[PDB]
Amino acid sequence: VNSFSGYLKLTDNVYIKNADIVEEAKKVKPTVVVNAANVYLKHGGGVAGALNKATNNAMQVESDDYIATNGPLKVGGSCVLSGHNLAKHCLHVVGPNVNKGEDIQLLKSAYENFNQHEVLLAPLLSAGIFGADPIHSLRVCVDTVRTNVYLAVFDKNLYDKLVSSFL
Ligand SMILES: Cn1ccc2c(N)ncnc21
Cα–Cα–Cα angle for 131, 6, 14, rounded to 5 degrees = 55
Number of domains, the chain: 1
Q: Which residues pair with 149 in a beta bridge?
A: 14, 120
Exposed, middle or buried: residue 135 (CB in 10 Å: 0-12, 13-18, 19+)? middle
The closest-lying atom of ligand 1 relative to the alpha carbon of residue 50 is 7
Is ligand 1 within 6 A of the CB of residue 127? yes
Residue 43 C-alpha to ligand 1 middle, in angstroms? 13
Domain of residue 79 covers 1-167
The answer to whether 33 touches 1, Cβ cutoff 8 Å, is no
Cβ neighbours of residue 16 closer than 8 Å, sequence gap 6 or more: 7, 8, 10, 138, 150, 151, 153, 159, 162, 163
Q: Among 90, 154, 157, which is best to mutate for testing ligand 1, by the most ligand atoms less than 8 A from CB?
A: 154
Output the CA 72–ligand 1 centroid distance in Å.
23
* Residue 50 Cβ < 6 Å to ligand 1: yes
d(C-alpha 65, C-alpha 67), whole Å: 6
Question: Could you tell me which of 142, 121, 165, 138 has the C-alpha nearest to residue 12?
Answer: 142
